[PDB]
Amino acid sequence: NLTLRYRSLVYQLNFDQTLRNVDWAPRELVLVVQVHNRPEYLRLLLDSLRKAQGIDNVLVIFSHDFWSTEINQLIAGVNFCPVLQVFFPFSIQLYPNEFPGSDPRDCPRDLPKNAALKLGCINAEYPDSFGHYREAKFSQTKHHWWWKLHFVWERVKILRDYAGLILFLEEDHYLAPDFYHVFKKMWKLKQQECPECDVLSLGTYSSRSFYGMADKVDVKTWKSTEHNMGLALTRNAYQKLIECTDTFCTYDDYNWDWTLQYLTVSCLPKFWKVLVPQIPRIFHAGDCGCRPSTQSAQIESLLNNNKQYMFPETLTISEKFTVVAISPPRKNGGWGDIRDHELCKSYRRLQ
Ligand SMILES: O=c1ccn([C@@H]2O[C@H](COP(=O)(O)OP(=O)(O)O)[C@@H](O)[C@H]2O)c(=O)[nH]1
Numbered sequence: 001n002l003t004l005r006y007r008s009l010v011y012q013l014n015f016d017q018t019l020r021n022v023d024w025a026p027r028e029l030v031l032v033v034q035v036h037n038r039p040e041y042l043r044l045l046l047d048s049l050r051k052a053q054g055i056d057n058v059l060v061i062f063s064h065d066f067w068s069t070e071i072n073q074l075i076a077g078v079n080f081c082p083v084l085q086v087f088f089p090f091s092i093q094l095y096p097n098e099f100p101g102s103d104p105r106d107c108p109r110d111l112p113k114n115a116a117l118k119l120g121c122i123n124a125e126y127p128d129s130f131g132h133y134r135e136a137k138f139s140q141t142k143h144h145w146w147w148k149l150h151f152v153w154e155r156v157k158i159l160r161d162y163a164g165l166i167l168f169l170e171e172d173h174y175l176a177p178d179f180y181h182v183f184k185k186m187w188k189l190k191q192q193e194c195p196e197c198d199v200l201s202l203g204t205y206s207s208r209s210f211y212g213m214a215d216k217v218d219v220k221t222w223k224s225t226e227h228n229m230g231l232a233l234t235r236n237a238y239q240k241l242i243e244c245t246d247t248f249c250t251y252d253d254y255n256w257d258w259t260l261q262y263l264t265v266s267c268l269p270k271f272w273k274v275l276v277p278q279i280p281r282i283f284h285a286g287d288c289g290c291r292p293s294t295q296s297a298q299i300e301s302l303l304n305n306n307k308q309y310m311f312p313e314t315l316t317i318s319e320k321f322t323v324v325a326i327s328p329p330r331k332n333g334g335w336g337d338i339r340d341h342e343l344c345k346s347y348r349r350l351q
């Protein structure tokens with residue numbers, strides 16, 4: 001049975017934590033990449049890592065919820081920085097025909113709530129806020145995001161007592177070559193001028209020319225639609241998030257970032273404040289209008305045409321935008337199923 005085989009593979013690999021390209025300790029920055037099944041975009045991220053300055057000793061953790069030869073071969077080609085692969089142990093690939101996959105007794109995602117209650121399908125009493133029922137493939141990303149946040153801070157042996165920041169990104173992102181240069185200055189700038197800052201972001205989703213802006217950073221209230229790429233957390237920031245575990249895991253939104261938005265408004269004692277450059281050091285390649293080759297060339301052109309402005313010698317805080325009161329987001333749904341709630345709440349308790 002291939003499914004059972006994969007379960008055994010994932011258990012041993014998550015235990016062994018084989019570190020590639022290391023004979024060193026992780027310091028200052030570690031990257032964690034959420035990976036599913038888009039190797040064409042992963043290849044683009046890896047190319048951006050290859051071209052990035054100063055990261056020979058930056059650990060990059062790839063977190064997978066899908067096993068494939070192509071994906072593992074891509075990551076195995078990385079010879080230029082420390083690499084670790086970890087594997088989400090409750091993926092749909094490992095549990096296809098039972099929760100958190102699709103139990104054949106589950107309610108159809110679009111069966112009306114009133115009909116589901118009369119039918120007795122097993123999750124009929126737990127629709128989302130729109131009266132819909134769970135779809136396994138739409139719940140997986142939030143599960144994977146919350147599991148790997150716990151796993152890297154608590155269960156990765158090389159990160160015992162780690163005192164740097166961990167920067168979270170995704171398989172379809174592209175890093176600017178000065179991203180690490182800029183991160184280090186951003187962190188020093190946070191220590192010097194923004195003690196109220198909770199998190200760092202490498203950039204938002206927005207100029208053709210970088211003149212006068214590539215050296216500027218803003219202090220803003222964190223907002224999920226703007227600041228969900230390349231999010232760097234301290235241990236303190238992570239510990240404050242897990243104080244809101246039940247809220248994260250029960251809030252009826254299958255988006256991890258919209259769920260964080262709700263947390264910053266409803267469960268954290270203060271809104272998150274983020275330090276973020278005016279010129280992004282991270283780009284979303286999985287968005288167009290996508291040919292991955294087209295995306296890479298356009299980003300290459302934008303960054304190289306602006307080469308004279310990259311690697312700024314000094315960063316300065318230019319703007320401060322402080323939200324005092326804000327409406328909570330509307331729920332996007334997809335997260336009403338108590339089994340999703342309970343599995344999400346279990347990650348830090350199991351083993
Ligand atoms: O089953 C899945 C599907 C997606 N993702 C991850 O969710 C992130 C966002 O997915 P995508 O970029 O497709 O969504 P979009 O950016 O279009 O909202 C990516 O890092 C994927 O690797 C995942 O972890 N498990």
Ligand SMILES: [Mn+2]
Pocket residue numbers: 172284286287
């Ligand atoms: Mn994307």
